Design a protein around this ligand. Structure first.
Ligand SMILES: CCCCCCCCCCCCCCCC(=O)OC[C@H](COP(=O)(O)O)OC(=O)CCCCCCCCCCCCC
Ligand SMILES: CCCCCCCCCCCCCCCC(=O)OC[C@H](COP(=O)(O)O)OC(=O)CCCCCCCCCCCCC
Ligand SMILES: [Cl-]
Ligand SMILES: [Cl-]
Ligand SMILES: [Cl-]
Ligand SMILES: [Cl-]
Ligand SMILES: [Fe+3]
Ligand SMILES: [Fe+3]
Lengths: 256, 256
């Protein structure tokens, strides 16, 4: 027996039941829903699906709100064990010829007093110029491409080089995409983003995302995860024929 | 996209989000729910699971409540194409020496004005003395055992013979049984029942179940589908050594 489950489950079932009566959900609709749940499972989309609609709320309960950096969902594409980068400067692992503009990120990690948090490790992950994540696409190796950890200098500053991630489309043809495009008449795009996770002894993990100014999807994120402070100004420069996009961000972590 | 589907989804979504805040669902709890949903599907238990918890409510919306016969859930074990029985009287297909007490069911199919519904077909199915349903158990062949269609006499009366169903246990070991037995600390038993489906041109389908007086789970159906109108008095008598259980019911259909 588990009392937590009993408490919650009965109120959950009561609420869905009232929901079924109040919205007149009939036999054929029910079977549609049922078959839809089955197909989400068959496509392995539950993490994708649940993250898209409910994970922002779970984050809220967990991280609260305040002076520190805002959360954004982890999503389903994180992978533990990303390699530590200590090169100067640190570059995420990528293919020779890795497509996209080049990107340089600088920033810092401090608490709310502005003391540097030397004990932090920062995970980074993002998709290819083509909208795929390593480990999650048949078109990419199951290797740590575009994934890495960096540690702050003792003054708290950090830096990593990579490629510029682009807007990402949840597949139109899977059940998650079919809900977003067809049944809801919306779309299934997210704006371009860099995923960040920062942990440190004495501190609450920060899991967040960084977005880019002028992204067409900033106001219609299909996972509803954009916050204004997380949208980054871009300074575009040329070097040797290659465009570099320079972005910067100061992370503040929450005590505990 | 259909306006109501959209407003239904957005509202469902708000229900869940409020639920998550109001009860403070944590990240690990969220992950537990996620992997459990993944389980139900991998076990092929969505029909079993949703039927257990929500199909009664869906039924109440769809069929309603009046002076016609009460609905009860279809559940996951129905099978199309059962044979027409026309013997004297109709006997459901069963093995030689099929275990359990012999059962004789009698009754009628009428409209609400008392007139017999000659165009009706009644499907019947129920489990064996061992709690097995044919086509859903490796302990039985994939043949129409304890499943059949009967047709009323011109005066609306009906009769078939079978064996007496007994309490049915949802498997303990599966995700549905785990939530029921282990996490909720209850049981996964249903009381003994006979499944009935009646269709007739110009009438709405009746899906219902018949239960038996004195069953120990009439007050604790793991699927919440017992209604006192559908609990049948049993007249038990001996005939040439064998116990017969006699049960009777007058079905009433609503017009289209
Ligand atoms: C409209 C269709 C509805 C579909 C809903 C299906 C979701 C039902 C989830 C059933 C709960 C699973 C219980 C898992 C218990 C377990 O495996 O033990 C592990 C863990 C340690 O034990 C725990 O303490 C985890 C407790 C999780 C809280 C369960 C609350 C169930 C209410 C549904 C909340 C829906 C909001 C996302
Ligand atoms: C933490 C728990 C999360 C549980 C997830 C539940 C899964 C939600 C499933 C929503 C998918 C909607 C089905 C696709 C709709 C569709 O195909 O077009 C509409 C269709 C028209 O003819 P086909 O039929 C319908 O209108 C189906 C009704 C759609 C209602 C969706 C609103 C979700 C409410 C779920 C209530 C739960 C009842 C058991
Ligand atoms: Cl992992
Ligand atoms: Cl700690
Ligand atoms: Cl603080
Ligand atoms: Cl008709
Ligand atoms: Fe992402
Ligand atoms: Fe049954």
């Amino acid at each position: 027996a588990n009392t937590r489950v009993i408490e919650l489950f009965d109120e959950f079932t009561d609420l869905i039941r009232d929901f079924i009566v109040r919205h007149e959900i009939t036999t054929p609709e029910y079977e549609t829903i049922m078959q839809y749940m089955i197909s989400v499972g068959e496509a392995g989309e539950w993490p994708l699906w649940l993250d898209a609609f409910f994970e922002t709320t779970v984050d809220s309960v967990s991280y609260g709100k305040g002076n520190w950096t805002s959360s954004a969902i982890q999503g389903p594409f994180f992978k533990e064990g990303a390699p530590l980068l200590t090169g100067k400067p640190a570059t995420l692992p990528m293919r020779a010829d890795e497509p996209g503009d080049r990107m340089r990120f600088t920033g810092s990690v401090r608490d709310t007093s502005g003391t540097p948090i030397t004990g932090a490790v920062i995970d980074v992950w993002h998709s290819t110029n083509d909208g795929n994540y390593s480990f999650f696409s048949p078109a990419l190796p199951d290797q740590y491409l575009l994934r890495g950890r960096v540690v702050p200098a003792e003054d708290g500053s950090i830096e990593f080089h990579s490629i510029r991630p682009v807007p990402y489309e949840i597949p139109k043809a899977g059940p998650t995409g079919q809900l977003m495009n067809s049944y809801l008449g919306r779309h299934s795009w997210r704006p371009a983003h860099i995923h960040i996770r920062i942990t440190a002894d004495g501190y609450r993990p920060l899991i967040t995302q960084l977005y880019f100014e002028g992204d067409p999807y900033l106001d219609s994120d299909s996972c509803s995860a954009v916050k204004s402070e997380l949208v980054l100004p871009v300074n575009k420069i040329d070097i040797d024929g290659e465009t570099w996009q320079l972005v910067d961000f100061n992370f503040i972590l929450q005590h505990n």
